Amino acid sequence: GFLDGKRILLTGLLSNRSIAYGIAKACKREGAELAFTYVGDRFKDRITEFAAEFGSELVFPCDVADDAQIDALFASLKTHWDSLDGLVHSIGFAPREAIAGDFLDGLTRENFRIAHDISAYSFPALAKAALPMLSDDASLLTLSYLGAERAIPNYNTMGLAKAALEASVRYLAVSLGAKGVRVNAISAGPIKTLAASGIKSFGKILDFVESNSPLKRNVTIEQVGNAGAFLLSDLASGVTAEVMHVDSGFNAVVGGM
Amino acid sequence: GFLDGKRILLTGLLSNRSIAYGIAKACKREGAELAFTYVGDRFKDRITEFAAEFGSELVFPCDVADDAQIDALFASLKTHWDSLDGLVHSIGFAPREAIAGDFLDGLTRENFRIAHDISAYSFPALAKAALPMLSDDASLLTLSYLGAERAIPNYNTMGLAKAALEASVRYLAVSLGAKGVRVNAISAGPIKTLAASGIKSFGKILDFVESNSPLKRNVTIEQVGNAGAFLLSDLASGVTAEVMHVDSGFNAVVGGM
Amino acid sequence: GFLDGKRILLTGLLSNRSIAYGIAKACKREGAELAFTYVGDRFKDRITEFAAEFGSELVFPCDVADDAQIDALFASLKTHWDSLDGLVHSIGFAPREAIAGDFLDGLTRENFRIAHDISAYSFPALAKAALPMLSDDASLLTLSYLGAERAIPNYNTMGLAKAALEASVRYLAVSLGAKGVRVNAISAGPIKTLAASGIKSFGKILDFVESNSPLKRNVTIEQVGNAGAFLLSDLASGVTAEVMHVDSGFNAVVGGM
Amino acid sequence: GFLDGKRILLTGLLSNRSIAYGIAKACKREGAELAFTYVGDRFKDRITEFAAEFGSELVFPCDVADDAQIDALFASLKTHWDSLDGLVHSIGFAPREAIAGDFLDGLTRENFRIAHDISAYSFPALAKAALPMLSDDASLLTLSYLGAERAIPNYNTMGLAKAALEASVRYLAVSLGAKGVRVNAISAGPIKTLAASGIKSFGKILDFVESNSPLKRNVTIEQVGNAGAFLLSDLASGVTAEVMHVDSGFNAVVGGM
Ligand SMILES: NC(=O)c1ccc[n+]([C@@H]2O[C@H](COP(=O)([O-])OP(=O)(O)OC[C@H]3O[C@@H](n4cnc5c(N)ncnc54)[C@H](O)[C@@H]3O)[C@@H](O)[C@H]2O)c1
Ligand SMILES: NC(=O)c1ccc[n+]([C@@H]2O[C@H](COP(=O)([O-])OP(=O)(O)OC[C@H]3O[C@@H](n4cnc5c(N)ncnc54)[C@H](O)[C@@H]3O)[C@@H](O)[C@H]2O)c1
Ligand SMILES: NC(=O)c1ccc[n+]([C@@H]2O[C@H](COP(=O)([O-])OP(=O)(O)OC[C@H]3O[C@@H](n4cnc5c(N)ncnc54)[C@H](O)[C@@H]3O)[C@@H](O)[C@H]2O)c1
Ligand SMILES: NC(=O)c1ccc[n+]([C@@H]2O[C@H](COP(=O)([O-])OP(=O)(O)OC[C@H]3O[C@@H](n4cnc5c(N)ncnc54)[C@H](O)[C@@H]3O)[C@@H](O)[C@H]2O)c1
Ligand SMILES: CCc1ccc(Oc2ccccc2)c(O)c1
Ligand SMILES: CCc1ccc(Oc2ccccc2)c(O)c1
Ligand SMILES: CCc1ccc(Oc2ccccc2)c(O)c1
Ligand SMILES: CCc1ccc(Oc2ccccc2)c(O)c1
């Protein structure tokens, strides 16, 4: 496969609907060796089952709010892997009120802080902690959304955080690029996941993209997963600092008229 | 003038080189009534002199890190003005190490938090606190930089914060737009100000833009000020959610080759 | 006014609904001296009346399909004005089938050629013919549409031509910038004009922008006109190579969901 | 391979330095069956050798300036293939003076017409002629350049044509998307090819991208080829209307300062 021998750490695999699950499946298919993170003790058994499905027992806790856990993640991983070839950041969070209704109604300093801390800061934070063990041709991938680019109803504070995340892709690409490391995002179309269900009226977004995207269909975690596997691979060695849309072309139209 | 009768509050007027000074001068010329904020007791006398230069004694302290001071700002202003027609957010801050050298070297959770808190969150925070007194045709203006759009050497963590700021312009425009309120940014070219001098190798950016911009010259606070006055006025009643470049066209080229 | 003494040539003033009419009205208000072009002998009397309304008898024929008429335009204008300070290109055309229904159904080599010739090439063509008489601080303005940036139903071949037009703004800005000349576009929201009525289902676009723009209202030729007058003036001396949206913020959202 | 069974027609394979050669090599590796076009009788033997290298004798003349040759191309191809799964448009041309020196100096109506006819119109023209034989999951790919997005020295008239080309990707994606067909571009970094050598000071662009791109290296036809093969494949079934940069991240920075 086109990821033969590549060692890839995946965050964010919460359920079999997770974007990270689709990425994991595609990476394993293409020959990668995988490792996984989780948050919260009650999820240890579930993530362990997922890891086993992908031929791995490499599972580590990491709440990205916590500097100590970020450092311990890579210390733990290093006991197994001398080097890391891929990193998938598939992590986002905002308090419920910050992704519902009017943008200002749900804006507080703490809601802003938390959304940006978990959804944006954590990506370059993981990159920095990983750097001593990154291979020279390593590839780092995050997940963003069109809400970064244009105002989407209810997405609100997450739109600000995704914009900062996409900027971090560019600044990371410069910082890490001379070494040879690539950094990219996929701006995924709407997919029904646990996180997605936190956005007020997500169902309306899903239906609108199905009706108005050029391909007249929503994307799947398999499609995002394949795009992800591509970006993580040497097939994409010419590509860095890129935000690739995998959204059935929806970003490129003015729909619904 | 084209701002006759308009009541405009300006933040960020630190010295006569400040972008806010240029905006103040243009607004006063076009007939606006002005009020000003400052941070730090040692600046009270200086900002009072500036206010007097622009025919006003309306000066208020506001450290945008502090929720209480934000609320007290508008309570104080309200004792003078029943309504507010314009708001100029000309405020940015990042710790020194976060705007020098390598992006990851200067990245910490706290540096990230502070840069985003002061440079991005504070804009919609002021908008929310101002809303009860905003006139229906009020106009809110912030200042951004090209570092939001593309990676610029040393700008680093501020690039992430400006990207979030530009997203906030769009989400603010939606929140406030039905009332009739407009929200925009100017993405200014490099100007030698106190804040600018915090960026490592700012002089190199200044010289490069002078040599490679389409107009082969750097912008001035007078030029940014006039663009600002325009956006704050009813001349611009068709314009919202816009990030207007005032940078001699530099953003639009690939220079230096 | 902020255009005192400025001599500005306006193309495209077909009726009192034309975008160019709004620009003319704003420019005259701000003190400019105006001159006008027209196409087709039956329009001589109408454009002459418009010119008189704006205090001018300077009217010249110019079909931009014709190199000879472009050259004769500036030779004629030069008999009156030693120098030209502003140029408004408010000209677009595509064959009916190229702006209706499916994009490929209406695509032919000739439809493509004509749409790009009249709608895109003509702008830098006028700039080149005008250059010997342009003042050093002259300002050139064209009108574009969001269809350049994203696919809009029915806009079709005009979307390609507007994309080329917006690129021409950038290349013109570089060519003319060292002299001091500025070049910009306004990307206007939908306005019911004669040209607009050629687009299939224009009414649907108009209604959608009214309902989904941040300001919940369509723009007027007065709003576009004021933005235009600003860009043509020394107020905008810091601005070149810019495509400014004047569309009630519509470009910045994902609406209709 | 990930293109097993896919039948792909490639235009533009002129020499072993051509971008199309890199795409051909990657597609063959991944299991595709290939067919090729050429222009000019003196090239028949050369393109036939290339086709043989990729296990094919399917070679057809097509000058995209000529409607009859475009129609005869697909009639000829149809005698061999019932359906077409991929189309690679790797074709660009502008008269020498239109890609050298000052933008206006090299602008004529005919230079404009020719550059847009061959470099932009020809892509949707091929798509339209191919449509009756396109499979439902076919993928169409064109090659663009950063000169579409920002002004690059000497690229001049080609910048306008590439902007129109990128718009055509979006309008094609909408037209063909309901059927299931995807349409994308790769915006490639500078590569020394025969066409590239027509651009004045191409060597300077090549050197600048090597020094200032995030990866500090120029891209190769192998890297562009792999990205191309990906986009042509079912791996990319979630991706349409996309302009993917394969340029070592150069587009994403402000370099040379
Ligand atoms: N589902 C969509 O439509 C969609 C579209 C575009 C982008 N995205 C993005 O994709 C990414 C993945 O989300 P998803 O849609 O697969 O939903 P998901 O709920 O399956 O995954 C979200 C993950 O974020 C993790 N997370 C939250 N807080 C964390 C913390 N403090 N530390 C570590 N991990 C934490 C969760 O544990 C979870 O695994 C997110 O960044 C999301 O913003 C999703
Ligand atoms: N000078 C440039 O080249 C340039 C270019 C683009 C954008 N900008 C932006 O313009 C804005 C103004 O900066 P400037 O260049 O005029 O420099 P400046 O130093 O004159 O102004 C910066 C202002 O930020 C204020 N500020 C910092 N922390 C604050 C806080 N906690 N509470 C309230 N105010 C605070 C400072 O007091 C100061 O008045 C900034 O947002 C800056 O990012 C500047
Ligand atoms: N009305 C809108 O919603 C809208 C929105 C965005 C952009 N625009 C653009 O604004 C510009 C003006 O159009 P309008 O909406 O004011 O409609 P309009 O019909 O009033 O003006 C169009 C003008 O194009 C001129 N024209 C056409 N072919 C010409 C030729 N061969 N030579 C010289 N002039 C020629 C017409 O004479 C007419 O004056 C156009 O470029 C149009 O694309 C319009
Ligand atoms: N080389 C680069 O740096 C670079 C970067 C970005 C984009 N591109 C684009 O990639 C594409 C391929 O060019 P290349 O760099 O591989 O150089 P190339 O010279 O190898 O290929 C150009 C091809 O265009 C074909 N062509 C020209 N006129 C034609 C016509 N009338 N009919 C049919 N074919 C015609 C030529 O025959 C040739 O095969 C072009 O569109 C070019 O603009 C090149
Ligand atoms: C509408 C598409 C979409 C769905 C889910 C997402 O993940 C989230 C959402 C909110 C908070 C945290 C993560 C996301 O970013 C975008
Ligand atoms: C290079 C142009 C530029 C100069 C000054 C700025 O203001 C700052 C800079 C750093 C931290 C806080 C504010 C800015 O944003 C951009
Ligand atoms: C939908 C807004 C809009 C309306 C009118 C326009 O002018 C045209 C339209 C078609 C052909 C020529 C000029 C235009 O460009 C955009
Ligand atoms: C600088 C990168 C680059 C090199 C070659 C290209 O192909 C051309 C160039 C000019 C005319 C026609 C095709 C191109 O488009 C872009």
Side-chain angles (χ1 to χ4, degrees):
Chain A
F2 60 76
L3 283 168
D4 282 352
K6 295 281 190 170
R7 285 171 173 185
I8 302 176
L9 172 67
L10 289 102
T11 62
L13 206 175
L14 188 55
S15 75
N16 67 6
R17 304 215 91 169
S18 289
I19 285 176
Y21 181 78
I23 299 172
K25 189 153 46 156
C27 289
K28 186 68 184 77
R29 188 194 67 238
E30 298 296 336
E33 296 168 32
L34 303 182
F36 302 80
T37 67
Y38 66 99
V39 197
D41 293 24
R42 82 176 176 92
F43 296 99
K44 190 181 186 186
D45 292 345
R46 184 194 294 179
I47 190 58
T48 300
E49 299 169 12
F50 280 128
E53 161 178 3
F54 300 117
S56 175
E57 298 180 82
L58 303 181
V59 296
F60 313 93
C62 185
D63 180 343
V64 298
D66 191 326
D67 285 1
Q69 295 187 41
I70 289 174
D71 290 343
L73 167 58
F74 296 99
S76 288
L77 187 61
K78 182 71 183 191
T79 71
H80 297 275
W81 287 352
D82 170 73
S83 61
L84 180 62
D85 302 305
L87 172 71
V88 174
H89 176 268
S90 192
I91 290 170
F93 180 82
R96 165 170 63 101
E97 64 168 342
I99 46 178
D102 174 79
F103 169 67
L104 287 179
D105 287 343
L107 180 80
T108 66
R109 193 181 307 267
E110 186 72 359
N111 288 351
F112 176 99
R113 180 192 69 73
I114 289 165
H116 286 75
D117 189 48
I118 307 305
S119 308
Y121 168 74
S122 65
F123 181 45
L126 290 175
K128 185 177 177 173
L131 176 61
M133 71 184 297
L134 290 177
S135 62
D136 285 347
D137 50 2
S139 183
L140 317 186
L141 174 72
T142 187
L143 277 300
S144 192
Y145 180 59
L146 183 58
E149 301 180 35
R150 300 198 290 283
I152 297 198
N154 303 290
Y155 201 62
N156 300 352
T157 292
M158 279 300 297
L160 282 55
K162 292 302 192 182
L165 179 68
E166 292 187 14
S168 84
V169 168
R170 297 184 283 275
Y171 284 92
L172 282 170
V174 173
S175 177
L176 299 175
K179 171 179 167 64
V181 173
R182 299 175 300 99
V183 185
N184 296 289
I186 283 165
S187 179
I191 299 171
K192 198 194 178 199
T193 57
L194 294 161
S197 72
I199 305 163
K200 186 185 220 130
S201 300
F202 172 76
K204 292 183 187 181
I205 300 173
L206 195 63
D207 284 10
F208 191 87
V209 174
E210 180 178 352
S211 297
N212 295 285
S213 63
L215 288 166
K216 300 290 176 269
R217 72 201 185 196
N218 279 307
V219 292
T220 62
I221 61 177
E222 286 70 40
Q223 289 166 336
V224 174
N226 281 327
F230 163 74
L231 287 175
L232 290 161
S233 78
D234 293 344
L235 293 174
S237 60
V239 183
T240 194
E242 184 78 347
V243 174
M244 178 191 180
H245 304 103
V246 185
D247 70 341
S248 294
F250 177 77
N251 72 96
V253 310
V254 183
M257 310 200 294
Chain B
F2 60 76
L3 283 168
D4 282 352
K6 295 281 190 170
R7 285 171 173 185
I8 302 176
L9 172 67
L10 289 102
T11 62
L13 206 175
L14 188 55
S15 75
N16 67 6
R17 304 215 91 169
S18 289
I19 285 176
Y21 181 78
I23 299 172
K25 189 153 46 156
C27 289
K28 186 68 184 77
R29 188 194 67 238
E30 298 296 336
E33 296 168 32
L34 303 182
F36 302 80
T37 67
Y38 66 99
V39 197
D41 293 24
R42 82 176 176 92
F43 296 99
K44 190 181 186 186
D45 292 345
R46 184 194 294 179
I47 190 58
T48 300
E49 299 169 12
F50 280 128
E53 161 178 3
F54 300 117
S56 175
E57 298 180 82
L58 303 181
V59 296
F60 313 93
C62 185
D63 180 343
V64 298
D66 191 326
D67 285 1
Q69 295 187 41
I70 289 174
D71 290 343
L73 167 58
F74 296 99
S76 288
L77 187 61
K78 182 71 183 191
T79 71
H80 297 275
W81 287 352
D82 170 73
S83 61
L84 180 62
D85 302 305
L87 172 71
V88 174
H89 176 268
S90 192
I91 290 170
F93 180 82
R96 165 170 63 101
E97 64 168 342
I99 46 178
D102 174 79
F103 169 67
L104 287 179
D105 287 343
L107 180 80
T108 66
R109 193 181 307 267
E110 186 72 359
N111 288 351
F112 176 99
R113 180 192 69 73
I114 289 165
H116 286 75
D117 189 48
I118 307 305
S119 308
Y121 168 74
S122 65
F123 181 45
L126 290 175
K128 185 177 177 173
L131 176 61
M133 71 184 297
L134 290 177
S135 62
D136 285 347
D137 50 2
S139 183
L140 317 186
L141 174 72
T142 187
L143 277 300
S144 192
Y145 180 59
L146 183 58
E149 301 180 35
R150 300 198 290 283
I152 297 198
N154 303 290
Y155 201 62
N156 300 352
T157 292
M158 279 300 297
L160 282 55
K162 292 302 192 182
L165 179 68
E166 292 187 14
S168 84
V169 168
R170 297 184 283 275
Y171 284 92
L172 282 170
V174 173
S175 177
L176 299 175
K179 171 179 167 64
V181 173
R182 299 175 300 99
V183 185
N184 296 289
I186 283 165
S187 179
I191 299 171
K192 198 194 178 199
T193 57
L194 294 161
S197 72
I199 305 163
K200 186 185 220 130
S201 300
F202 172 76
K204 292 183 187 181
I205 300 173
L206 195 63
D207 284 10
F208 191 87
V209 174
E210 180 178 352
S211 297
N212 295 285
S213 63
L215 288 166
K216 300 290 176 269
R217 72 201 185 196
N218 279 307
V219 292
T220 62
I221 61 177
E222 286 70 40
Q223 289 166 336
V224 174
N226 281 327
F230 163 74
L231 287 175
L232 290 161
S233 78
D234 293 344
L235 293 174
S237 60
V239 183
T240 194
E242 184 78 347
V243 174
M244 178 191 180
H245 304 103
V246 185
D247 70 341
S248 294
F250 177 77
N251 72 96
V253 310
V254 183
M257 310 200 294
Chain C
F2 60 76
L3 283 168
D4 282 352
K6 295 281 190 170
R7 285 171 173 185
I8 302 176
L9 172 67
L10 289 102
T11 62
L13 206 175
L14 188 55
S15 75
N16 67 6
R17 304 215 91 169
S18 289
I19 285 176
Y21 181 78
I23 299 172
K25 189 153 46 156
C27 289
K28 186 68 184 77
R29 188 194 67 238
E30 298 296 336
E33 296 168 32
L34 303 182
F36 302 80
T37 67
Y38 66 99
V39 197
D41 293 24
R42 82 176 176 92
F43 296 99
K44 190 181 186 186
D45 292 345
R46 184 194 294 179
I47 190 58
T48 300
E49 299 169 12
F50 280 128
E53 161 178 3
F54 300 117
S56 175
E57 298 180 82
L58 303 181
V59 296
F60 313 93
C62 185
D63 180 343
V64 298
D66 191 326
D67 285 1
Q69 295 187 41
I70 289 174
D71 290 343
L73 167 58
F74 296 99
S76 288
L77 187 61
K78 182 71 183 191
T79 71
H80 297 275
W81 287 352
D82 170 73
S83 61
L84 180 62
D85 302 305
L87 172 71
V88 174
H89 176 268
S90 192
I91 290 170
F93 180 82
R96 165 170 63 101
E97 64 168 342
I99 46 178
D102 174 79
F103 169 67
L104 287 179
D105 287 343
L107 180 80
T108 66
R109 193 181 307 267
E110 186 72 359
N111 288 351
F112 176 99
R113 180 192 69 73
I114 289 165
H116 286 75
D117 189 48
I118 307 305
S119 308
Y121 168 74
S122 65
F123 181 45
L126 290 175
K128 185 177 177 173
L131 176 61
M133 71 184 297
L134 290 177
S135 62
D136 285 347
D137 50 2
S139 183
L140 317 186
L141 174 72
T142 187
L143 277 300
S144 192
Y145 180 59
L146 183 58
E149 301 180 35
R150 300 198 290 283
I152 297 198
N154 303 290
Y155 201 62
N156 300 352
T157 292
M158 279 300 297
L160 282 55
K162 292 302 192 182
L165 179 68
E166 292 187 14
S168 84
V169 168
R170 297 184 283 275
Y171 284 92
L172 282 170
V174 173
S175 177
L176 299 175
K179 171 179 167 64
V181 173
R182 299 175 300 99
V183 185
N184 296 289
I186 283 165
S187 179
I191 299 171
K192 198 194 178 199
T193 57
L194 294 161
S197 72
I199 305 163
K200 186 185 220 130
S201 300
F202 172 76
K204 292 183 187 181
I205 300 173
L206 195 63
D207 284 10
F208 191 87
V209 174
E210 180 178 352
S211 297
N212 295 285
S213 63
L215 288 166
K216 300 290 176 269
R217 72 201 185 196
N218 279 307
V219 292
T220 62
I221 61 177
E222 286 70 40
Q223 289 166 336
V224 174
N226 281 327
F230 163 74
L231 287 175
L232 290 161
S233 78
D234 293 344
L235 293 174
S237 60
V239 183
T240 194
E242 184 78 347
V243 174
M244 178 191 180
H245 304 103
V246 185
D247 70 341
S248 294
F250 177 77
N251 72 96
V253 310
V254 183
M257 310 200 294
Chain D
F2 60 76
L3 283 168
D4 282 352
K6 295 281 190 170
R7 285 171 173 185
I8 302 176
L9 172 67
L10 289 102
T11 62
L13 206 175
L14 188 55
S15 75
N16 67 6
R17 304 215 91 169
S18 289
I19 285 176
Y21 181 78
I23 299 172
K25 189 153 46 156
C27 289
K28 186 68 184 77
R29 188 194 67 238
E30 298 296 336
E33 296 168 32
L34 303 182
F36 302 80
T37 67
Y38 66 99
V39 197
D41 293 24
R42 82 176 176 92
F43 296 99
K44 190 181 186 186
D45 292 345
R46 184 194 294 179
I47 190 58
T48 300
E49 299 169 12
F50 280 128
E53 161 178 3
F54 300 117
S56 175
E57 298 180 82
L58 303 181
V59 296
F60 313 93
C62 185
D63 180 343
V64 298
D66 191 326
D67 285 1
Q69 295 187 41
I70 289 174
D71 290 343
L73 167 58
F74 296 99
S76 288
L77 187 61
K78 182 71 183 191
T79 71
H80 297 275
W81 287 352
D82 170 73
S83 61
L84 180 62
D85 302 305
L87 172 71
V88 174
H89 176 268
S90 192
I91 290 170
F93 180 82
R96 165 170 63 101
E97 64 168 342
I99 46 178
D102 174 79
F103 169 67
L104 287 179
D105 287 343
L107 180 80
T108 66
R109 193 181 307 267
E110 186 72 359
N111 288 351
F112 176 99
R113 180 192 69 73
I114 289 165
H116 286 75
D117 189 48
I118 307 305
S119 308
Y121 168 74
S122 65
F123 181 45
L126 290 175
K128 185 177 177 173
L131 176 61
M133 71 184 297
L134 290 177
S135 62
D136 285 347
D137 50 2
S139 183
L140 317 186
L141 174 72
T142 187
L143 277 300
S144 192
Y145 180 59
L146 183 58
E149 301 180 35
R150 300 198 290 283
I152 297 198
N154 303 290
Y155 201 62
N156 300 352
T157 292
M158 279 300 297
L160 282 55
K162 292 302 192 182
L165 179 68
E166 292 187 14
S168 84
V169 168
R170 297 184 283 275
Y171 284 92
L172 282 170
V174 173
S175 177
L176 299 175
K179 171 179 167 64
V181 173
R182 299 175 300 99
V183 185
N184 296 289
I186 283 165
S187 179
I191 299 171
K192 198 194 178 199
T193 57
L194 294 161
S197 72
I199 305 163
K200 186 185 220 130
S201 300
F202 172 76
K204 292 183 187 181
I205 300 173
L206 195 63
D207 284 10
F208 191 87
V209 174
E210 180 178 352
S211 297
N212 295 285
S213 63
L215 288 166
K216 300 290 176 269
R217 72 201 185 196
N218 279 307
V219 292
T220 62
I221 61 177
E222 286 70 40
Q223 289 166 336
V224 174
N226 281 327
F230 163 74
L231 287 175
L232 290 161
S233 78
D234 293 344
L235 293 174
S237 60
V239 183
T240 194
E242 184 78 347
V243 174
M244 178 190 180
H245 304 103
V246 185
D247 70 341
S248 294
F250 177 77
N251 72 96
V253 310
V254 183
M257 310 200 294

